Amino acid sequence: GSSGSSGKIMIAALDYDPGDGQMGGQGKGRLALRAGDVVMVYGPMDDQGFYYGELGGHRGLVPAHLLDHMSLHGH
């Protein structure tokens, strides 16, 4: 049929402020998430357990533990 499911949608259960003491080098620091920030990720995570998403036009590695797997609502 038609293959889809391009990227996932998760929310930052907590306010992640990696800006304070970002990584060293050989890449790029993580993204700062806020309580209730619907960020879009892509593909699996890395050895460290970080996902590849972007929030606010900024790509970077996000925490795969702070995020929350949304559910299917219905009325």
Swiss-Prot record:
Superkingdom, taxonomy of origin: Eukaryota
Compartments in which it is found: Cytoplasm, Cytoskeleton
Domain SH3 span(s) in chain numbering: 8-72
Annotated family: Belongs to the RIMBP family.
Role description: Probable component of the manchette, a microtubule-based structure which plays a key role in sperm head morphogenesis during late stages of sperm development.
Subunit and interaction comment: Interacts with LRGUK (via guanylate kinase-like domain). Interacts (via C-terminus) with HOOK1 (via coiled-coil region).
Protein name: RIMS-binding protein 3A
Underlying gene: RIMBP3
Residues of the full protein shown: 1572 to 1639 of 1639
